Amino acid sequence: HMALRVGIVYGTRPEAIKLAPLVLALDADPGFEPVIITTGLDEINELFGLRPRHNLDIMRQRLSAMASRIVGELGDPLLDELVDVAVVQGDTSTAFAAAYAAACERIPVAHLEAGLRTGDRFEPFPEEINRRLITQLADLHFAPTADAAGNLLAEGVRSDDVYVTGNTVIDAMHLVLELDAFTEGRQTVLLTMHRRESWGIPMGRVAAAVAELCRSRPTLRFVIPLHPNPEVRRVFRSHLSSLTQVLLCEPLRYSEFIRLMHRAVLVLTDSGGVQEEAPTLGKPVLVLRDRTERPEGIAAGCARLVGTDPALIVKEVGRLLDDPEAYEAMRRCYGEGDAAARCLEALRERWLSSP
Amino acid sequence: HMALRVGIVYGTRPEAIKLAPLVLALDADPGFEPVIITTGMLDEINELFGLRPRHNLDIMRPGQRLSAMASRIVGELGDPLLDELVDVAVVQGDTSTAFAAAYAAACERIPVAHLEAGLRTGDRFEPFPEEINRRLITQLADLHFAPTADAAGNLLAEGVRSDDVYVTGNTVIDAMHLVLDRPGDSANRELDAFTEGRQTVLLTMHRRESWGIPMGRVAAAVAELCRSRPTLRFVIPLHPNPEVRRVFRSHLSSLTQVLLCEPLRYSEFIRLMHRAVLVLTDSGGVQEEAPTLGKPVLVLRDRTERPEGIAAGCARLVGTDPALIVKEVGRLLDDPEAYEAMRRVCYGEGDAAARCLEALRERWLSSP
Amino acid sequence: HMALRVGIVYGTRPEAIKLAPLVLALDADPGFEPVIITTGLDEINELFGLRPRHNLDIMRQRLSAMASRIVGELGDPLLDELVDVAVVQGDTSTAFAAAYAAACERIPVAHLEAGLRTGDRFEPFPEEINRRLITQLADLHFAPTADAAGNLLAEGVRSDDVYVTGNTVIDAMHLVLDNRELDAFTEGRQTVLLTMHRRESWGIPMGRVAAAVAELCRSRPTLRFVIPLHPNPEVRRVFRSHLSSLTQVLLCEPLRYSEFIRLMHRAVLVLTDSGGVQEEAPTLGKPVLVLRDRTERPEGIAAGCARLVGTDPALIVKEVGRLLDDPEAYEAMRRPGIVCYGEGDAAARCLEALRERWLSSP
Amino acid sequence: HMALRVGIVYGTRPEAIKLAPLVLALDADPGFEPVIITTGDEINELFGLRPRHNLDIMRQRLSAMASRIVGELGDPLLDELVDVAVVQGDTSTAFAAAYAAACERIPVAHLEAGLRTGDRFEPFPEEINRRLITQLADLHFAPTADAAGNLLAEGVRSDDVYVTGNTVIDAMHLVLDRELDAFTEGRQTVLLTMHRRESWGIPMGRVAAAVAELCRSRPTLRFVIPLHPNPEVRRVFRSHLSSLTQVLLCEPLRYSEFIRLMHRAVLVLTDSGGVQEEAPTLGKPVLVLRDRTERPEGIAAGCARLVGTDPALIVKEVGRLLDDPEAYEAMRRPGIVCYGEGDAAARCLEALRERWLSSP
Ligand SMILES: O=c1ccn([C@@H]2O[C@H](COP(=O)(O)OP(=O)(O)O)[C@@H](O)[C@H]2O)c(=O)[nH]1
Ligand SMILES: O=c1ccn([C@@H]2O[C@H](COP(=O)(O)OP(=O)(O)O)[C@@H](O)[C@H]2O)c(=O)[nH]1
Ligand SMILES: O=c1ccn([C@@H]2O[C@H](COP(=O)(O)OP(=O)(O)O)[C@@H](O)[C@H]2O)c(=O)[nH]1
Ligand SMILES: O=c1ccn([C@@H]2O[C@H](COP(=O)(O)OP(=O)(O)O)[C@@H](O)[C@H]2O)c(=O)[nH]1
Ligand code: NA
Ligand code: NA
Ligand code: NA
Ligand code: NA
């Protein structure tokens, strides 16, 4: 019996984690077959049982060269694997270039995690322009919130093409629910920082803030899983590697990482995923950015913008550690953890029905 | 002294004609320098308007996949844009060049302006890829030169800030005016001989979705009208594709009432449109040009991105139904009341190049 | 003003000579534009004013590699030049591969010099199979004789697709009838013209023909031979090694078409395995002895203009002697009233066929 | 008679200007033949430089560029029968070309040798390039005694170091032999050039802000700003200053036009290495738009002052020089010569002749 062959295209850990619940749902349901094509991970592929049919070796590079290669070369594997529908996730240059490649072969596109907007043009670049381009290419939009759905309507998308499914990152969290020795019976702050526009001086300022807090509060601990880039590792290592209050880590497997987030007293991050995951475990989030495409957590008081100002990070972390009223004010946004299923029903409704 | 270096990227006759007025204005004004980069019939238009390309990427050929073409423009346009020290890039219309070039410009953080912005059919991926290209260019462009208020509205509906939209009108009107004051370059011996003191219908048809059977139906309609009306003449400049030429040639080449032509130089073509009693076309350009010369237009399509001419009664949808084409052409030839009902500016005054310049100056040649 | 863009594809001197009249006619008539694409000549291009738009550098080689490249690469130039119709000539692997390439792009094909058959399968190879393949690909067939038209009908071609136009090689002859040393050598002597090039005759059989020229030369001191040599070092060596000492023989480089037709006009008779020369020589009333065991030109055989002689030296000697001694046998091989292969207006008749087929509506 | 075939390798305007005097001297003297190989036309035409080969390598990752020059420059050096190669300055070309020459056992001379900031990999890769070229070169043409000292400190034998001065002074003299005049005529004109990559974005914005404040405060003051050919540099200046008719933003100027303008300027703001050498030689005070320089000679002699990208300090420092004629004359003090007399090409030739056209 005919399965809808659903192309799944990603290049990065974040995309893979958010797409994994949808791949698993597509694999479980007999009406669909997931066909994974990567542009890049093996740790996450193993954890969720993702088996790529093809790996283009494109990402290492100028944005134009990367986009050129994906547009040029993704058509063939999509045609060879007899893909009926392609799903791309998020704001990546892969999601955009893959969606354009799909459109060139008249393969309909669905967009997982659609409608997030900062409101500031080409800020960040190229993520903000990618979302707006994918938005025009996609036939179907899986919005994580009503706010996100509104942003799509404002860019001319028909209401019938938008499903508020919530975020699959919540599904993924639920599927995974020396580090213990280090955290056991201590107040532990979890920090991740990776955004390219923060590399160098601004990361130094955040590392300085962690240092000031550490000396001021001998019982305080930090765990910092480092983004796999030698420039990011060097700024943190050169600022914090001597302080035994800080445990610098290699990237953690998603299970180990979500477990650690569960034990943390609060979370400092510029991650989009962590901004969605941490509030769901009732951990206050201080966002190491000047803007966010996740204003829901800001408005609800789950999360506060803090940027890369060391004085403000120190103040804000202290406030939450000392004053339990301010702490509880940031605990009670992004879906129930059944988003994969709601995506499937949207796909079934759109491409597995007749009038 | 520092000039705003304005990149001008096109691949096709239609783009070149619409961009020519803007290139000329940029060349005349000392504050700007036009830098033409082509991705490509064109040398004729380049010569007529004095366009001198700085670079010609040899990317577009007849039998190429859309993905391969887009891939090459995205891959290769960056370097010439950087080497020529381009500050701002202008793309025109709905072409896959305009989209791929705009994306390439954006990758190098070169701001983009879109000439002829906001035209919409309202039907998704219809036609493909023109409708999706417009929507993609719309998100890439910092500045939008809309030809009408209707077009400006369509941009607002896709989330564009009002301050980024100028209603400049269509540069195709500028271009028309620049070739109507040029009778020597417009003189065509055999065309004049064929039309002089005869009722002449002008027909152009080129849209890919109409190739084969539908063009055959339109050629059948021209045949029926010709035999029924011995004094009636048709001039049909053929799109340079052998499959388009074969359908018209095989249906009409024996009728001496029909003159099948090679593509005509823009001057010769506008002159002919001026002498025509009415126009049958699926062309976007001709739908803008013909009403401006007070020629009724029958549009050989099921939809248009140009509803202004429909609403004003300048133009009527006719599709590729031979019965309806015959009826509609007859109506206009016999009944002078129906004819005058399709004549009276829908698409601007012919000063759009200048209005574009003032938008560029305002946006990228001013400081707080 | 709409011109039918007519692709002209060739790789060799023989194709170029036969296509030149058609190119000239297409250039003269305003309804058509010739678009030449070569797979290779400069001498012939200059003589007839042929100006190639593209030169693919394909022919120098295994048949499969050559065909593969033409099939692979000729489509693009045909599309770029906006060709409406492609013309190929004769039995060459270029004519076949080009016709297939044209057909892949849905470009209709016309075949110049269509329907010649030996009647023996894959003999010669690949010429005989090329003709039969081109025959199925072509929409339009310019047959040079009624016999050739019949052969096309027998392979299932519709009568309406066959025009008996005659051979353009006769047009080409007339266009060059409008050399110091050659005249000096022939002046007041009985001169035999010999050309031999067929690959299946290389080595021993050419040696036998060169032996026959030697025997005839020693036996008949007043007899002269002019032998323009095919441009291949193996062909040049067999003739040079057998005849370079005999001052009765003038071995030549390939001659410009004008010089060659002039020489054929002065010759008393012609020995050849050439298809072109078998068409040209009878038209100048020169008896032809064909250095082959078969011909695709049986019209000259039937009319007595030409006789099969093969590569048997005894028979060549006998047959050349017969014609030189006995003026009754000589006149029996001249029919200067009758034309086997057309009147020299074939280019025009091809144009009217193209106009009728692709520049009219029902 | 045998000419020493001297390879001349460059990829950029700055290298070409500094190498031009040496090429001309090599062309004039019959004992030498210059063989130009570029890795990159106005400058070539102006000085009559005729490249024998143009590798099309520079447009890109540093590793890919270096890899290509190391890989491919050997052949043209061998084909042109080069005996000795000269590289100039701190460019990745000068380094990769010098390494390529060394692989073919072609001796290397370094034009403009020994300039040091003293701060490691700052800037990158210029500072490491100088130290690598320094170990590859057999012969070092130092522009000052300070520079010669830096070479001795990195283990170079004293006999391999000639203090020749800077060829940029020669080049200036070779070009001192309409709208710009109209704009400057009878006005106090500041010349500003700024191009260093580490200053792109915010810091350039701060410098453009300083030009704006000075302009509004001093209606008679004029600025001419020839813009580095990069669209990000052009945008920051255009977006800050294009409305102020006291500022004339320019395209890159031909070397002659540029030196003429510098001659008419009252003072010079720059992060350029070349301009820091040229402007003092025309007695124009220089405010250096950087936090460090490889040219401390002008700092020490008072010809030039570090100013960085702080708008308050640029405003103060430009004002000081415009108002107080004592501070102005303190930055022209005739007597000390920081970067040579303009005869450096000749002194280079005598070093080449001495080293590779003599026998014991
Ligand atoms: O050591 C780590 C750090 C992060 N994450 C996961 O990585 C995702 C997002 O990290 P990223 O670097 O992608 O930031 P983003 O691109 O989402 O802004 C989230 O799902 C995290 O739970 C992880 O598994 N291990
Ligand atoms: O023989 C012709 C036919 C049309 N045009 C012009 O071509 C443009 C329209 O181009 P086309 O119809 O090929 O494309 P479209 O405009 O439909 O996108 C208009 O300005 C016409 O006046 C021309 O110059 N010569
Ligand atoms: O030295 C020569 C020999 C032949 N031909 C001409 O070449 C053509 C035939 O060439 P070939 O015999 O190689 O080809 P074939 O006719 O056997 O296919 C005929 O038109 C001859 O008139 C020529 O111009 N010069
Ligand atoms: O518009 C200009 C700007 C600079 N220069 C010259 O360029 C050289 C310095 O260029 P740049 O500042 O880019 O290089 P740097 O010296 O910092 O390497 C000097 O000799 C200047 O005279 C020029 O001719 N025109
Ligand atoms: Na399944
Ligand atoms: Na101008
Ligand atoms: Na002609
Ligand atoms: Na010399």
Residue numbers in the entry:
A (entry chain C): 0 to 39, 45 to 64, 67 to 183, 193 to 347, 352 to 374
B (entry chain A): 0 to 39, 44 to 347, 351 to 374
C (entry chain B): 0 to 39, 45 to 64, 67 to 184, 191 to 374
D (entry chain E): 0 to 39, 46 to 64, 67 to 184, 192 to 374
Paper text:
Here we report a structural and functional analysis for an epimerase, KasQ, that primes KSM biosynthesis rather than the previously proposed KasF/H, which instead acts as an acetyltransferase, inactivating KSM.
As revealed above, UDP or UDP-Glc is bound to its binding site at the interface of the two domains. The superimposition of KasQ–UDP and KasQ–UDP-Glc with an RMSD of 0.29 Å for 332 Cα atoms suggested no apparent conformational differences as a result of binding from different ligands. The electron density of UDP or UDP-Glc is well defined and consistent in the substrate binding site. The UDP binding site is highly conserved among all non-hydrolyzing UDP-GlcNAc 2-epimerases: the guanidino side chain of Arg12 and the backbone of Leu267 are in close contact with the uracil O2 atom, likely due to hydrogen bonding (3.1 Å and 3.4 Å, respectively). The backbone of Leu267 is also in a hydrogen-bonding distance to the O4 atom (3.1 Å) and the N3 atom (2.7 Å) of the uracil base. The two hydroxyl groups of the ribose moiety are associated with Glu292 (2.8 Å and 2.6 Å) by hydrogen bonds. His209 may play a role in stabilizing UDP by interacting with its α-phosphate (3.1 Å) and β-phosphate (2.6 Å). Ser286, Gly287, and Gly289 are three highly conserved residues for molecular recognition, in which Ser286 interacts with α/β phosphate (2.7 Å/3.2 Å, respectively), Gly287 is in contact with the O1/O2 atom of β-phosphate (3.3 Å/3.1 Å, respectively), and Gly289 is associated with the O1 atom of β-phosphate (2.9 Å). Of these, the binding affinity of UDP versus KasQ was shown to be 2–5-fold higher than that of the others, suggesting that UDP-sugar is most likely the physiological substrate for KasQ.
